[PDB]
Design goal:
Helix 4 packs across helix 5. Strands 3-2-1-4-5-6 form a six-stranded parallel beta sheet, with helices on both faces. By secondary structure, it is of the alpha/beta class. The chain contains eleven helices and six strands. It is globular, with a radius of gyration of 18 Å. Strand 4, helix 10 and strand 5 form a beta-alpha-beta unit. It has two domains: 163 residues, no CATH class; 77 residues, no CATH class. This is 2-haloalkanoic acid dehalogenase.
């Protein structure tokens, strides 16, 4: 079972390629400073993970940039601090400042030479263009929640992808699904019988941070601590 057996990689974006935990800590800085209970970084992230995933189930058709303002509000009310609608909307715009993991541009440019690259992402298209600039590669396809009408882990996001990869000359068996999130990505990837590769970004950290906890932890076919280590394994297959 080898990485070179696939023609294409489908990627999660935020958590896998974009460091959305740094980005949202920064976008929420002014809000959490009002709490003054000196909350840990991971307590903020997990509180966000709960409200974001519940709100993505509540309104599956809401553009991500309009859904994050509601999550900001839900956080503020949970913490008992005051806030404004203008601050909510600004936090929804902050995604364009969420930084890439620094190995992402290099790793994607390497993989571009061997793989068609697909994005399957919980995002709107306007917002994702700003992240695509940071990642500095051209994706063969971008299947966003806005395109789908729903957010991962919904069946609909994976059905949508399977319904369009034909236009790239691909079948589901050609695709290695590569992601950080057990809950958003690997539980549904396994359910659809995809080969999957877990990028364990939080390997040196405690808990799941900004990704919701999965009900039952899924299996995976590959695991690497980073995109750099994925590229290292692939170079290894080529020389062996």
């Amino acid at each position: 079972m080898r990485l070179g057996d696939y023609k294409a990689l489908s990627f999660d974006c935020y958590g896998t390629l974009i460091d959305w935990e740094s980005g949202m800590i920064e976008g929420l800085r002014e809000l959490t400073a009002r709490v003054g209970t000196d909350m840990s970084r991971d307590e903020i992230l997990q509180a966000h993970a709960r409200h974001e995933s519940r709100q993505q189930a509540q309104t599956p058709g809401k553009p991500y940039r309009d859904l994050l303002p509601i999550v900001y509000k839900r956080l503020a009310e949970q913490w008992g601090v005051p806030f404004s609608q203008a601050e909510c909307e600004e936090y929804g715009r902050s995604v364009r400042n969420w930084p890439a993991f620094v190995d992402s541009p290099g790793a994607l440019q390497y993989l571009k030479k061997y793989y068609k690259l697909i994005i399957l992402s919980n995002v709107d298209n306007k917002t994702f263009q700003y992240s695509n600039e940071k990642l500095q590669v051209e994706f063969d396809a971008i299947y966003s929640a806005e395109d789908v009408g729903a957010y991962k882990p919904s069946d609909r996001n994976f059905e949508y992808m399977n319904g369009h990869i034909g236009d790239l000359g691909l079948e589901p068996g050609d695709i290695l699904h590569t992601a950080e999130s057990l809950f958003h990505d690997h539980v549904p990837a396994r359910k659809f019988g995809m080969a999957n590769c877990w990028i364990y970004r939080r390997h040196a950290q405690e808990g799941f941070g900004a990704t919701m906890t999965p009900s039952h932890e899924p299996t995976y076919d590959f695991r690497f601590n980073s995109m750099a280590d994925l590229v290292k394994a692939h170079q290894e297959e080529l020389r062996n």
